[PDB]
Amino acid sequence: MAAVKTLNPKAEVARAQAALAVNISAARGLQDVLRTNLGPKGTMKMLVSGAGDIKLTKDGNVLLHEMQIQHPTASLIAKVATAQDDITGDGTTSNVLIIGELLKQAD
Amino acid sequence: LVLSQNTKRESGRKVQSGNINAAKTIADIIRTCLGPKSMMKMLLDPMGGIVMTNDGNAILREIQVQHPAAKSMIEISRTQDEEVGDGTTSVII
Amino acid sequence: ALHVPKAPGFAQMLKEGAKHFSGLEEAVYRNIQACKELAQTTRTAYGPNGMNKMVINHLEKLFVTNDAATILRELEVQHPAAKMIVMASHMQEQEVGDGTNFVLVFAGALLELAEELLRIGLSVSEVIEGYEIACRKAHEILPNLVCCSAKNLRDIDEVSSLLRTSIMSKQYGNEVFLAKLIAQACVSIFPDSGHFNVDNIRVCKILGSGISSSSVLHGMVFKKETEGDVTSVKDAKIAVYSCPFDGMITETKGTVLIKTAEELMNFSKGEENLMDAQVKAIADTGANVVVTGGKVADMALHYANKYNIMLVRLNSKWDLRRLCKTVGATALPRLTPPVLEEMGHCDSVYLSEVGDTQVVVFKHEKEDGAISTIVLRGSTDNLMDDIERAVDDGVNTFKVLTRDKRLVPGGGATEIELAKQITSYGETCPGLEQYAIKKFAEAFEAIPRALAENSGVKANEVISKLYAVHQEGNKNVGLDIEAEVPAVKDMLEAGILDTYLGKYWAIKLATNAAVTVLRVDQIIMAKPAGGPKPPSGK
Amino acid sequence: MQDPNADTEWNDILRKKGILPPVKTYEDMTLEELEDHEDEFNEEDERAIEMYRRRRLAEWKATKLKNKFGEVLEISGKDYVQEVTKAGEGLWVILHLYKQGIPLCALINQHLSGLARKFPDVKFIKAISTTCIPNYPDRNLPTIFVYLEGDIKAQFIGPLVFGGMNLTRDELEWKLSESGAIMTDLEENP
Amino acid sequence: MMPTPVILLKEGTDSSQGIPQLVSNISACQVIAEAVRTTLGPRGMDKLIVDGRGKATISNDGATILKLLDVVHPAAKTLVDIAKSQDAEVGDGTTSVTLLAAEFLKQVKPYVEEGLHPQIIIRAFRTATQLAVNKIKEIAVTVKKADKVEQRKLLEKCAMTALSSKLISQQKAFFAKMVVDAVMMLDDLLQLKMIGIKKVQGGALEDSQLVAGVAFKKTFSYAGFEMQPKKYHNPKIALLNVELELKAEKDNAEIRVHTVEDYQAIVDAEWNILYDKLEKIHHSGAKVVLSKLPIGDVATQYFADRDMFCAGRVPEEDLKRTMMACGGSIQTSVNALSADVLGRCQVFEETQIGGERYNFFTGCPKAKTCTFILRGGAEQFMEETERSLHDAIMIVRRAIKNDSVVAGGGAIEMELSKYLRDYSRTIPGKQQLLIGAYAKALEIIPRQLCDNAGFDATNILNKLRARHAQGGTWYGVDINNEDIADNFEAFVWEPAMVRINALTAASEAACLIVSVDETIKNPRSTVD
Amino acid sequence: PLSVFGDRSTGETIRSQNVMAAASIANIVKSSLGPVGLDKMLVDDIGDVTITN
Amino acid sequence: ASMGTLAFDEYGRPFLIIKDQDRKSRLMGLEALKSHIMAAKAVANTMRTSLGPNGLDKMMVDKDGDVTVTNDGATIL
Amino acid sequence: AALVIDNGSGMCKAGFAGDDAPRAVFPSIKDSYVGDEAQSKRGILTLKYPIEHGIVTNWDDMEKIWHHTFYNELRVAPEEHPVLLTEAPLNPKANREKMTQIMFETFNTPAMYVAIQAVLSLYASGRTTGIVMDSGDGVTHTVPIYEGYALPHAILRLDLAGRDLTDYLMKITTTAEREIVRDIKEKLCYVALDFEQEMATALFQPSFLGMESCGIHETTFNSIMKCDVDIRKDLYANTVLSGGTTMYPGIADRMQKEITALAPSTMKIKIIAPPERKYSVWIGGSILASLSTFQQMWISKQEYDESGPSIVHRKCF
Ligand SMILES: Nc1ncnc2c1ncn2[C@@H]1O[C@H](COP(=O)(O)OP(=O)(O)O)[C@@H](O)[C@H]1O
Ligand SMILES: Nc1ncnc2c1ncn2[C@@H]1O[C@H](COP(=O)(O)OP(=O)(O)O)[C@@H](O)[C@H]1O
Ligand SMILES: Nc1ncnc2c1ncn2[C@@H]1O[C@H](COP(=O)(O)OP(=O)(O)O)[C@@H](O)[C@H]1O
Ligand SMILES: Nc1ncnc2c1ncn2[C@@H]1O[C@H](COP(=O)(O)OP(=O)(O)O)[C@@H](O)[C@H]1O
Ligand SMILES: [Mg+2]
Ligand SMILES: [Mg+2]
Predict the structure, then answer these.
(1) What is the atom index within ligand 3 of the atom nearest the CA of C498?
(2) Which of B78, E315, H39, H309 shows a CA-CA span of 20 to 30 A to E182?
(3) Cis previous bond, D142, omega within 30
(4) Sign of torsion, CA E388 E391 E392 E393?
(5) CATH T-level assignment (fold) for domain D73-178
(6) DSSP run (H or E) holding E406
(7) Residue B82 to chain A, least CA–CA distance (Å)
(8) Measured on CA atoms in the order C415, C416, C419, C421, is the torsion positive or negative?
(9) DSSP letter at C296?
(10) Minimal CA separation from B32 to chain C, in Å
(11) H-helix or E-strand containing E484?
C-alpha cells in the first residue's frame, strides 16, 4: 500500500496526516482518562490487576502504568510522565493534560 | 529432480529491474528525512520500544527486508554510518 | 507499543477487503508502473520481426499470435489503469482494425515520460496540458506527412501493394500471397458504391494443405453436407426459405380430430399428397436447389429427391442472410414457390471434399458478387487462426482506405518525423509546457526503438541514423528490416506505408488513455466479487 | 470448491451460509549469579532476595549433604547385592561391567572417573563381569547398568550400542542422563 | 522482482520467456516425437494406450497415438495438430511429419541456444521447404501413358507400401488387391462413406473379404423372421423410410366416436391402413424389404406369409450403400413403388459370419460401393486392421487423382538432403548453416528406419549419402538385407503428395514453434 | 521381477537425464563467463545473501 | 522405465507435456515385451489344466457370488 | 435488505437476504385476541396455489398471495426493499412482463430481479458453472450454466417428472391406490445401474414408459454438446441434480455411467446430488441478493418506468 509494504509486506504504516491523527487521538484519549485525576475534587480510580489485586489511585503515573493500553504515543507520554515522577515526584497528570492539550490546539 | 524443490531462480531484465526497484524503494523510504526541514519517524521495535528519528541509518536499521537489493542498501547505510557517521540518507538517495 | 492502529476516519470506516490508494506515490506511480508492465508484455510483438506469443486462457484455450488486441483480450489484466489502456487499444481495434500495439506502446511510453516529468517537479495538470497541446500539434502535423494515396481500389496489384504492409507485421514470411488473396477478395466486394462491408469477407478454415493452398472463392462455402441425393448443380436456381422444409403447422395447437374410419384412412395420404404438391410447385418454378434455414421432413426430402432438387440446411440465420446476399434471393417464411425476383442464381452449387472436410459450395464464375470467401488451408488450427487475424487486418486496412485514401510512411518514418517536428515546436513554447511537449515528442521514438529492438539491432544506432537523415530533409526514411546491422531506407520507394487514419486514431486514443490514467489521483478498490460476472455481457 | 478460495466476497457469503468450511529475576540466578550483580537489585527487591538467597543456600547445603561419595569405586560380585540392589534409598546407581582387557572398557572407565567427580550425587561403581555374573559372555562389554532403588532403570549393553571408540566424555554423559540418572545440562551433540 | 501492491495479471499467471522457453518448447516436441518414433517403417511396432475408462487402444498409426496422448504442452500440441492435418489431407505420413518437425527443431536447437534470431531460422525453413517441395514435384515419376493395367499396378504398389508397416503386412498383397478393388468401384468423389467396413470377431485375416455389393448385420428381428426365407436369386428390393406397424396415425391425432360401429370401423381402419401399405409393398414385386424405420411383428409375419424378406431399423449409411449398390431409391411413401425406384441384385442371402448373422446383397454389377468384412481375434485387432485399411484406401484415392510417385525407404529424403546441401553450399553463409541443418534433419527418416530395424544407421546413411552423390535418386533402405537398394525398382512407391505435405506441415510446425518467444498460462478458472 | 526396493532407469532415459542434469548445472553458470559475464545473488532460505561470479 | 517423462527442465522451469504425467505409467521396449509374455504365460498355464478328457474344471465366482463350474476356456476367461 | 421470494412451483418460501431459511412459507405453513389477524389469513388459507407445473395460471391469485406474503407473513413494506423473484426455465416472456408490472406498479418495489430456479439451485450448492437437472412434479429441465447464467440456447426440455415416473408404476387406477404407488415412489426406489442385474434378484429409456423422444442422460449430454467445447469440461464435471422427483430414486450413478459412455473418453464427470436442504432455490436467491452484483443486475424502478416490458425483456430482441 506504500513504499515500506513493498519490501516488508507485513508492515504497518501511518503517513503524514494519518500519523498525526493517530498520535493526537491517543493523546486526547489519555487526556480524557486523566482529566478526572486533577485536583482534590478529582475521583479515585480502582485498578484490578490480572491477579485480582486492587489499587486505589489518583496519581497520573500510577494510573498510566496501570491502565491497559498498547499505543505508541501512550508509551511516549507514559515515559515522559515517568521521568517527571522520577525527578520531581509530582506533575504527571498535569504533564499528560498539557501534552494532550498542546496537541489538540495544534491540530 | 536436479536442484532442490525449494530452489527458485530468476534471471535477466526481470532481476535487474527488480533490484533497481528495490533500491528505489529503500530510497523513497527515507527521501523525506534529508535536510534542515526533515520530519521525524516513530518506528516500533519488536521489543516494544520506540525510535523517533530522522537519521537514515536509524530508520533503515529498524526496518527489515527480504529483497537482497534492499539488504544491500541497508548495508550501504551501515557502512556510511560506521565510516564517517553522517550522510546515511544522502548515500541512499 | 507494538502495533500501528488505523487512523481515525476513512482508514477505519473502510470495509475489510477494500483498498484505498492516494497521491502520486500510492496511485499515480503505481498506475504508470502497471501500464509500463503492460507495454512491456506486448512490446516484443511489434512489427514484422515481432515474435508470437502462446497465451492460454482460463478455459485452457491456446492463442498463438502477435496481434496485440488478441493477446490483451486473452490475458486476464486485473490492474485498473492497465485495464484502461487495454480499453483504449480495443477501441482502436474497433475503429480501425490495426494499430492496437501502437496504442499500447505509445501510451506506455507517454506514461513513463510523465512519471519522469513528475519526478523532476511538474504537476499532473501541467503534464496533461503539454500532452494535449502536443497531441493537437501531432494531428496538425500528420496531414502534411502523407506521402502516397491509393488512387484506385478496383485494381488488384495496387491494392495488393497497399495491403502488404498491414499483412506483413503479421505473417512476415508470406506476405505477397496473402496480400494477393485479400486484394482479390476485397475487390470482388466493394461495389460501384463507395460503401465496403467487412462482414461480407468470409473466411473458411479447412485443415491440411499449407497456407499456399489457400484460395479465394466468389461465393460461399458451408462445412455442411446435402440432405438429399443430388450433390451437384450447374445452373443453380436457389430458393431460400426461413421456414422448415415441412408442412406448416398451427401456432396455437393442432389436433387431428378423427370421427370416421374414412378420415383416418385418408389423413396420411392427404398429408403426403399435400407435400408432393408443395415441392412440385417449387420444382416447377425452375428451382433446382432449395436452402432451408429450419429442419427437413422425411416426406419433403423424399419428394425433393424425386424431383431432382438439391436440399441444403443452414442452421444459422446469419449464414442464411449471407447466402441470400450471395445468390440474390429472398428468404421466404412460407413454403410457397418463389417468384422470379425472390429466386437466387449461381453458376454452380456442388458438394466437395476439401481435405477431411465435406463442404457445400455456392460458386459464381463472375469476378464479383455481394460476398466473397477466403478458404484458408493450413496444417494447424492455431496457424489458421493467426492467418485469419492477418486477413482481418488486411480487410480493415482496405476499409480504412475506402474511408480515407491517404498514406503515411511506415517503418518508423512518420514517428521519427513527428518526434522531430514536435520537439521543434516544444523548443519554441516557453513555460512549463515545453518539458511535456518534448517528452510527448520523444515518446514517438518508442516505435522505431521497438522495431529496431525486434529486428535484432541497436535501437540507438537506428534512431540516431533516422534523426540524421530526417534532418537532411527526408521524411519518408525509416529503418530497414533487411539488414543485420543498423540501417535505414526510403519507406516510400520500398512501399512500406501506413494509413493516415490508422496513425490519427492511434495517436488520439493513446494520448487520451495516458491523459485519463494521469487524471486519476485516488483509487478506491472494492473487495473482489464472486458475482456471476456482468449481467449484460453474458 | 467450484472457485478458488481467495479474498473475495462470494466465498465469504458461502462461508456465512454454511458452505466452504473456513536475566529474568533473582529467582533463577544462582549463588554465583546473585553475587555477580548484588548492587543492581533494588532494596525493595532485596527484601525478598534475602528469602530467595536463604532458599538457595538451603538447597545447596542439602546437595552438599547428598554428595556422599563423588568417586568411582569397584565392587566384587560377593558384595554386589549390598552395593547395588540395596544401595541408598532413591540413590541413582551406575554400574560399569567391564574387563580390563577391552580398551573400550578402559575408555568408559576413564569417562566415568571424570563424571564421578562431576556428579558427586550419583553413585558410580565398576566391576569385572566375569566376577559379577557367572560366565558373562566375552563379547558383551562394556555394560552400563543404571539402577534406582534396586531396580534396573537402563542398560546400555554391547561394544557397539555404547557409542564407538570416538566416545568423548560428552555423549556418554548424555546416554547416562537418558534414564535421568546424572542429569546433565546439554543435548546429544555427537 | 517486487510484490507490487496490485498486480497486472491474475494471480497464478505463469510466464515463460526467452531462449529457455524456446529450448523447452523444442524439448517437448522431441518428447512427442520419441512417443511415435518406433512405429516408423516395416520394422515398426505398435503402441498400447489405456484410457481412464480402462479401454485399451493398440495402434501403429501416429495420428491415433498422439490423439490418445493427453498432450497439454502448448508447443507440443502443434505436432499433434500437424499429425491430424496429415491424416486429414493425405492419410499417411502421420509419424513422418512429427519426426520431421521435431528433427528440424532438434537441428536448430544449437543455433537457438546461441542467440540466433528465430526470424532467420524461419526464413531458412521456408526457403528449404519451397526448394524441397519443388524438387519432389520435379523428380516425381508420373507415367504419361494412362494405361489401365499400369494404373492398377501403381495403385497396388502404393497400397502395399502404405500397408507394409501394420499387423497385416503378412497379407498386405491380399489387402492391397482389395483396397484397389474397393476404390476402383467408387464413382468420382471416392466417398469413404461409400466403402463399408464391418468387423466380425472370429476368423483369420485371410478369412476377411470384400463384397462387391453390400452387407450388414441382422437387425432386431421380431417373431416370424425365422419363418421368412433367407436366399433369393434375383430379388427386387424395396428400400424405404417407412415405419411398418400398428401405430398412432399421428401423435397429435385424437379419435372421437359415439358408436360401437364407429369404434369397430376405426379398429379395422388402422388395420386396413397397415395392410394397405403392406399390400402396395407386396405388389411392387419386391421380395426383399429394408426400412430405415422399424418393421413391426405384424408386418414381419405378413411378409413371412407372402414369402418375402423384411429388415427394419437398418442404419442410414447401410441403406444408402444398399441404394448405391442395388440401384434404387429410398422411399418414405409406398404409393409409387415403380421398378424405377426398386433395387436389384443377383443374390441376397442371410449367412452366419463368426457368431453374427449378416445379410449380403451380392451380384450388383452396377455397384458404386463395396463392403469390407474384417475378421480377427480381438476388438482392437480389427480396429487396427480397419485403421491400416483406411491408410491404404486414402493412399489409393490420392494416387488415383494424381499418379505421381516417388520412392520410399528414405530415398526421397536422401535426395532432398543432397539437393539442399548442394544449394546451401552456394549461398552467403548464415542461411548456409540453417539450410544444411534442414538437410541433416531430412536424414531422420532413413536413420529411424535403420534404428527400428536393428541396423547401424550410421553405416547405412554413409552408403546412402555416397550412392546419392554418385548418381542415383531412388536408393534407400532395404530392410530384409540390412543394406541399401533402388527402392523405385523394389516397388517401395509412395504418392508424391505424401512427402510434399509432410515437408510442408513439418516446416510450418517448426516455424510456428520457433516464432513463439513467450508463453503465458492464465490460472485455471472454475478450479475444481 | 527384480523386486529391488527402488526405482530403475535404463538406457536412453538415464542418459538423457544425466545430460539434462549436467546441462542444467552448466546453464546456471553460462551467464557468468568472460568480461561480459554478470554476477549472481544467492539467498540461503534465511536472508543470508551471497553475490558472486 | 516408468513415470512417463521426468526431467522437468534443464532451465528449472516447469515441464508439463502430458496430462497427469506424474500419475501415469509407461513401459518401453524389451521389458514391455517380457511383461506381455509373463501375463500371457500366466493365463495359458492357468488354462492348460482344463485340456483333454482328464482335464479339470474351474469354479468361477462372479461379483454377486454366483458359482459357475466349467471346463470351457471361453467361459473361464 | 433484499426480499427473496422463491416461488419455485412450491410455496412462497419468502424472507430476507442473509437468512439461511425463508420466513414466509405461506402455502401450508393468535386467535381469541382482538383484530383481523386470523380472518385475513383464513381467506388466503383456502386459496388455490397459482403456479401449476412451474407456470403461473391465475395472476390475481399470485398477486394476492405475494401481498399477503409481504404485509402479513413478513410485516414489511416492498417500497424500500429490492425483490428477487424466481421463474422456471424457459418461462414465457408474457409472464415476466406481468410479474414485473405487478412488482413495480402494484408493490412499487424500488428494484427487482427474476432468476432461474436452476441457477439459484446451483448457487446454493456453492458453484457457478454446471448443468442442472431439475425434475419436480410437473416438468423436467436441463439447464446449462456458465459464469452463473443459464445459457438461453442450450436449454433442452423433456417431460418425465414425478407424475410420468409413477405412471408406469401404477401400470404395474383410483386416486388412493395410485397414491399407494406414489408412496412407494416417495419412499426408496433405488436407481438401477442395469435393470438386468436389478430384476434378476426379483426415464433413461423412453420405451420403458412409452415415450419416443430421449432419455434424461441423452438430454444432459446434448445440452452439454450445445455449449462451448472449452466449458464442456465444466458442464460434464459439474452436473448438479435437483428436484424431489430425481431424489426419490436417488439417481446418480446410472446417469454418470451412461453420460460417461456418451461423452468422449476425456472429461471426467462427477455429479453432486446429496444436499437436499429443502430450500436450495431460496438459499441460492439469498446468496445472489446478498452479493453486490445483484445491485448491478437490478432492474430498477426508474428503468422500468422508462422502458416497460422492454426493460423486463432486457432488449436484445
Ligand atoms: N485546594 C486547592 N484549590 C485549588 N487548586 C488546587 C488545590 N490543591 C491543588 N490544586 C492544584 O491542582 C493541580 C493538580 O494537583 P495534582 O493532581 O496533585 O497535580 P498533578 O496533576 O501533577 O497530579 C495543581 O496544579 C495544584 O496547584
Ligand atoms: N540549512 C541548510 N540548507 C540547505 N542545505 C542544508 C542545510 N543544512 C544541511 N544541508 C545539506 O542537506 C543535507 C542534509 O543532510 P541530513 O539530512 O543530515 O542527512 P545526512 O547528512 O545524513 O545525509 C546535507 O547534504 C547538508 O549538506
Ligand atoms: N517491412 C517493414 N519494415 C519496417 N517496418 C514495418 C514493415 N512492415 C510493417 N512495419 C511497421 O510495423 C508497425 C506495425 O506492426 P504491428 O505489429 O502490426 O503493430 P500494429 O498492431 O500497431 O499495426 C508499423 O510501425 C509499421 O510501419
Ligand atoms: N518395404 C519397405 N522397405 C523400405 N522402406 C519402407 C518399406 N515400406 C515402407 N517403407 C518406408 O517407411 C515409411 C513409412 O512410415 P510408416 O510409419 O510406415 O507410415 P507413415 O507414412 O505414417 O510414417 C516410408 O518412408 C516408407 O518409404
Ligand atoms: Mg498492423
Ligand atoms: Mg504409412
Answers:
(1) 27
(2) E315
(3) yes
(4) positive
(5) Glutaredoxin (3.40.30)
(6) strand E405-407
(7) 24
(8) negative
(9) B
(10) 13
(11) strand E483-486
Listed by number, the residues of chain H in 293-312 with a beta carbon closer than 8 Å to a beta carbon of chain E are none
D20 and H CB contact within 8 Å? yes
How far, in Å, from the CA of E410 to the mean position of ligand 4?
8
Which residues form ligand 1's pocket by a CB distance below 6 Å?
Answer: A 37-40, 60, 90-94
Report strand pairing: D73-74 vs D123-128.
parallel
E527 touches chain D (CB under 8 A): yes
* Residues across chain H: 317
Distance from CA of D10 to the nearest CA of H (A): 7
Domain of residue C303 covers: 219-403
Cell of A17: 496526516
Q: Which residues of C touch E523 (CB under 8 A)?
A: 58, 76
Tell me the residues of F at the B interface, defined by beta carbons under 8 Å apart.
Answer: 20-21, 24-25, 28, 31, 41, 43, 45, 47, 49, 51
Burial (CB < 10 A; 0-12, 13-18, 19+), residue E355, is exposed
Chains that touch G (3 or more CB pairs under 8 A): B, E, F
CATH number of the domain encompassing residue C236: 3.50.7.10
From the list E52, E55, E526, which residue is nearest H234 (CB)? E526
Cβ H265–E70 below 8 Å, yes or no?
Answer: no
C26 reaches A (C-beta below 8 A): yes
Tell me which residues of chain G have a C-beta less than 8 Å from any C-beta of chain B. Answer: 8, 12
Main-chain phi, psi angles of C177, to 5 degrees:
-60, -55
Distance separating alpha carbons of residues E158 and D96, to the nearest angstrom:
93
- The strand pairing partners of C149, in sequence order, are C406
E94 included as an active-site residue: yes
Distance CA E106, CA E111 (A): 10
The grid coordinates of residue E145 equal 501413358
Long-range Cβ contacts of H150-156 (<8 Å, 24+ apart): H150/H89, H150/H116, H150/H118, H150/H119, H151/H227, H153/H226, H154/H223, H154/H224, H154/H226, H154/H227, H155/H89, H155/H90, H155/H223, H156/H219, H156/H222, H156/H223, H156/H226
Annotated catalytic, E95? Answer: yes
Interface check G52 vs E, CB under 8 A: no
| DSSP secondary structure, C266-289, as one string | HHHHHHHHHHHHHHHHHHHTT--E
Long-range contacts of C313-319 (CB under 8 A, 24+ apart): C313/C224, C313/C227, C313/C245, C314/C222, C314/C224, C317/C242, C317/C293, C319/C222
Residue E329 is assigned to a ligand binding site: no
AA identity, residue C318: W
* Cβ pair C57, E522 in contact under 8 A: yes
E165 is in an annotated binding site: yes
The resolution, in Å, is 3.1
Hey, which bits of H9-139 come out as E strands? 51-52, 55-56, 83-87, 111-116, 130-135
Residues D137 and D153: beta-carbon distance below 8 Å: no
- Residue ranges lining ligand 4, Cβ < 6 Å: E 39-42, 44, 62, 92-96, 161, 164-165, 408-410, 445, 449, 477, 479, 492, 494
Q: How far is CA E28 from CA C532, E86, E101, E396, G5, in A?
A: 37, 20, 12, 34, 10
Strands G67-70 and G58-61: antiparallel
DSSP C159-192: HHHHHHHHHHHSS-SS-HHHHHHHHHHHHHSS-S
DSSP H stretches of helix in E192-338 = 260-283, 297-305, 316-326
Q: Please name which of C531, H21, H126 lies closest in space to residue D19, comparing C-alpha atoms.
A: H126
What method did the depositors use to determine the structure? cryo-EM
E72 closest CB neighbour out of G5, G10, G19: G19
Find, among C70, B20, C171, the residue nearest to E520 by Cα: C70
CA-closest candidate to residue C320, choices C293, C284, C360: C293
| Sign of the CA dihedral with C244 first, then C248, C254, and C260 last | negative
Fold annotation for E211-400:
GroEL (3.50.7)
